Design a protein around this ligand. Sequence first.
Ligand SMILES: NC(=O)c1cn([C@@H]2O[C@H](CO)[C@@H](O)[C@H]2O)c2ncnc(N)c12
Ligand SMILES: NC(=O)c1cn([C@@H]2O[C@H](CO)[C@@H](O)[C@H]2O)c2ncnc(N)c12
Ligand code: NA
Ligand code: NA
Lengths: 311, 314
Amino acid sequence: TIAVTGSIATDHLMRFPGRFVSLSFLVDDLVMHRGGVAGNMAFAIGVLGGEVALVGAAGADFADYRDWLKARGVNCDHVLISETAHTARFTCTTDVDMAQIASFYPGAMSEARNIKLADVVSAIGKPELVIIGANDPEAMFLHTEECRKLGLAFAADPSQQLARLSGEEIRRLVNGAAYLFTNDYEWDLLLSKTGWSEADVMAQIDLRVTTLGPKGVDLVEPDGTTIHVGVVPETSQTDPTGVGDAFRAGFLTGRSAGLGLERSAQLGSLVAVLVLESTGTQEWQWDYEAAASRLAGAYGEHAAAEIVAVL
Amino acid sequence: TIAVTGSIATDHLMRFPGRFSEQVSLSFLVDDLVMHRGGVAGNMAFAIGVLGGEVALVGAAGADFADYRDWLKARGVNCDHVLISETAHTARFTCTTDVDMAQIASFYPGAMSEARNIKLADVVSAIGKPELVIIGANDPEAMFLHTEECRKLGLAFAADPSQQLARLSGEEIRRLVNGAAYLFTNDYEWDLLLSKTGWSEADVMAQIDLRVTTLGPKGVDLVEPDGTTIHVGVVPETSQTDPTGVGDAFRAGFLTGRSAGLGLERSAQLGSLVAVLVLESTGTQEWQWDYEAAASRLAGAYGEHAAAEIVAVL
Ligand SMILES: NC(=O)c1cn([C@@H]2O[C@H](CO)[C@@H](O)[C@H]2O)c2ncnc(N)c12
Ligand SMILES: NC(=O)c1cn([C@@H]2O[C@H](CO)[C@@H](O)[C@H]2O)c2ncnc(N)c12
Ligand code: NA
Ligand code: NA
């Protein structure tokens, strides 16, 4: 079972038909969707048939979201429901170039620091992997300390909170990680803020995964072995929100089904492009045949057959 | 009766405890998020009603408007002529304000776009000819059609395009100005209006009865076509919090003063008071009217005579 920690949110997503003080953008689309990094990854892992538990804090409004997730197989037992605060809110405007200007209001997310992974362990067993996703900062640290304490394997996934964290806090999130997930800009920011070199980082983790936007993804091992996977090319780009989360979910679902690194990253790339081609982060659909087809088109029929075999 | 046309909205207002000046992929971690009644026509109707004026709100909202409607009617606002869309939701304004009161916002029109289906002749028939029609930021075609109708039916109007000025072409702007009893803008909007229209300052003043140009912390200018200029400094703030709706508040206070028979300077002084009260609250309609506090801050800024004269007509 994969335990996903991180934000649970409502995403308010708008489209500006232009290209990015007193800035006002006239937007021509406004939709509200289920969101949060842990929401998104738990949803995708559940849709692809993995065993997954969502671990984070939401508000009393979470009931409908809860049903949505449970219908896809997500265990939400260990979602903390705040007595007073509302579920976090992400407000984002995306332009023609897929550039984005956003605000994030934590709300109930800040109470995630009150969750003890020991309860989840006691309730479902030791997880195969804990994803330490963008969350209340103290929660991210405490979750990581607990994984180290209880000997749980974890993925450091501090994407959107990296800008908000100090160098020392980042360094405390990385050591011992089975995986480090970031995008290339975040990778450079992590090196800068931590002062670590590339080699210093790779000495502390089992694998670095660096997404590269349209240039795909690198999976880098501490001995320098590098797998580069190009994207599943898009046909109808619409909103980039949640593409990183989808990639991580697909990749980790593939790993949990026993696929190798390259095959797992190819599955991740497929889920990523499906989210890119949807507005909300959890609005994509899983279609076995469409999946087989686009995997084959990008990566070859053998790769596609192997991937769809484990789903 | 003052007829207020323009946007009706829900405002989603957030505070960034930083500076946008310091900043493709911008994310602001905000420490406040509140949802409030909004839209320029909503805001000006609300303020005019709170100050005791006769006012009708004329614009388009969604089926969710019922609570808002009650809110406005309890303050004296006639909402009979709000058009409720069968399908669209009330417009949504989403705004993040930084420490310096700078702002980054998105506006989703929704039902606002149906305002072009409103005919001021119906409102005239139902309440009589308005004393003044405020042509506030709205669906662009609605702004044009409302202005054409005011000219047709001989209604006195205020050109108040503010936030839509950036979205309108020069020709559309020129069509909104001619014949206006008032032109309201801020100083940046005034420069943009001259640029996009190509008009000179004199070309504009030849077509309107009065220019009102707000200047942020530098107060407001009221300029007549013969160059007569009244400068009114602000009521100085004590607790700056969110600038949303400060312009609407000033316009409401000023026009309520004019409707109560005050002169230009006294009306602008009342406007300045309502403006600072909104500056000092988060939502645009969250301010409170306190007779004594009003008298006091008017006197502090403008002198005891001005304050007594203003509070007399309220
Ligand atoms: N841009 C931000 O600051 C954030 C956006 N999200 C979520 O990240 C998801 C996309 O990965 C969206 O569904 C959002 O809810 C966040 N989650 C946690 N912390 C944050 N600072 C953000
Ligand atoms: N920034 C924008 O583009 C707009 C903001 N508002 C409203 O303007 C009010 C403040 O004057 C707020 O209550 C908003 O609902 C608007 N109303 C009409 N048109 C617009 N383009 C805007
Ligand atoms: Na998306
Ligand atoms: Na305000």
